[PDB]
Structures are given as structure tokens and as C-alpha cells.
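Submission sheet (multi-component)
Chains listed below:
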Amino acid sequence: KKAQRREHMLKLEAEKKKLRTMLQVQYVLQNLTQEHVQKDFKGGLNGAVYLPSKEMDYLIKFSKLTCPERNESLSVEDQMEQSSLYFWDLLEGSEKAVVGTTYKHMKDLLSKLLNSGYFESIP
Amino acid sequence: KKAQRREHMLKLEAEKKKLRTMLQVQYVLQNLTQEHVQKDFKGGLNGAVYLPSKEMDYLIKFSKLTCPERNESLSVEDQMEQSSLYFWDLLEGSEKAVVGTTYKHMKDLLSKLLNSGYFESIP
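Outcome: structure written.
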């Protein structure tokens, strides 16, 4: 019973560190939709880790897919349900096909801009 | 060992249903900062569950506290760390003092606009 309590604290730290990386990834993909960012990554002109347009469009569509606008025919609860599953499959490092890539490479690709420098202190 | 796998599926559904309610609450507090909303709840003029200004300012400051703008002196990773903890203390129904209310009443108050009607199909 003593080791049963040590596992509860570890999961709380895991689900919290997840929630931290969540909002980080949300911040990355929201400002990613800006146009001055995608043109900046054309050759990395202001601290952007260079990325070809194939790898850009991979997640530029994911940003549209993961942080979308509400469908008036869809309840805004089940919209978040769909968006929440996308985020969850991303952290799992799964290999389900999505927009032409894999969820494992998605986390790696987004982790590349989670240490780039464009993700903090940007216009 | 068989019952150990049934618990993993239940936690996955719990952490997913959490992630669903998360983004719902984020959507509630983001559009909450709009001015046409707080003036609408002055007497519920377009489907708004009436709320006095004490109970409004409780969460109108929480929205500023929970979905803020980045501090240039703070790394945008630890900013999300702080915001993630606020969301997590909210779902726990805790009783820590915050902006003059309690986290248990916060979830109840926000659950009142999670079934109101102003939270779907709004300008």
C-alpha cells in the first residue's frame, strides 16, 4: 500500500508535465499560422531552424487541424473531444498516418521548435 | 495482472475526458474576455445565465490569470507550467484561495456556463 501512493505522485507529475508541454505545443501551432513565421522559415531569417516546405506543410495543416475554428453543425464539446485526441496521439509517439507523416515524427519535429528559439520572445 | 490492464484503460479515458473539458474551459475563458459578453451577462440579454459582477470578476480575472500573455522575463515553458497548475487545481475541486473564491466553486461556476448556451454558437 506504501508503493501504491508513490505511483500516484508520479502519475500526477506525468499528467502535469504533459499539461505543461500541451500548452507549449498549442502556443507553437497557434503563432505558427502567422504568415511572417512561415516565410521566415523559408531560409531561417530571424532565428528559425530551417525547414523545407514539405515538413512545414505537414504541421501547418496540423495547426489548422489541431487548433481549428468551431463547426456550427458540431457541438463545441465534441469538437474539443476530437482536438484532444489529436494532441493525445501526438504525445504517444504513435505511428498512425496523419497529413502524410507519423505521430512519432510529429513530436520530434515539434520538439525541434520547442528548443529552436523562435518559440520564445517573438513578435 | 488482468485487472492491472483494466485500470490503464480507465485512466486513459479519464485523462482524455479531462483533456476534452480542458479545451472547453479554455474556449470559455478566452471568449469570456470579450466585452460584448460581460455586458451581455449584466442581465442575460442574449442567452446569458445571469451572474452578478462579484461572480463575474471572480473568473474574468481568472481568465486573465489562466490564459495570459507571455512575460518577456519568463521562459514560455515555465509560463505554461504555471498556467497548467491553475487548470489542474481547478479540476481537482480544491479549496485553495484564489482571487477571493475557491477552486471547488470555480468548477461549479464554470460548469454553469458549460451548460448555459452562450458557450456554443456565439459571435
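Remark: The first strand of chain B starts at residue 97 and ends at 98.
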